[PDB]
Amino acid sequence: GKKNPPQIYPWMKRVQRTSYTRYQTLELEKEFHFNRYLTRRRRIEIAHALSLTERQIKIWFQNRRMKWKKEHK
């Protein structure tokens, strides 16, 4: 099951993944349906309300749009 590449290429080098709770996810999903975009303020109040950071909320929304972009809906 082990791979033996004839040579080790750059892309081959490196570069636990916390899961969100039903509540966090449900709420985020809930917020996103109110407005696919967030204001610096709303971003902060939601981050505190869900024990998540600002970054994590920003990123969660970024990813959420990519998914919204995809699935054309």
């Binding site: 082990k2 791979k3 004839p6 040579q7 892309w11 081959m12 490196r14 995809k70």
Partner: protein, 59 residues
């Protein structure tokens, strides 16, 4: 949700291993692979994503 056909995997694996030094097909290349395999470019992307990672993982 079934798996890709036998021919589609051979095609993707062939492209993949033929480009081991840089397994990052362009948008056009992804579209041509998708056409021949009969899937979406998105499925091609997932396919390369999983392949790239699962491969370096077993080195």
């Amino acid at each position: 949700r079934r798996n890709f056909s036998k021919q589609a995997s051979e095609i993707l694996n062939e492209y993949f291993y033929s480009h081991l030094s840089n397994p990052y097909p362009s948008e056009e290349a992804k579209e041509e692979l998708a056409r021949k395999c009969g899937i979406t470019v998105s499925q091609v992307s997932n396919w390369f994503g999983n392949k790239r990672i699962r491969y370096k993982k077993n080195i």
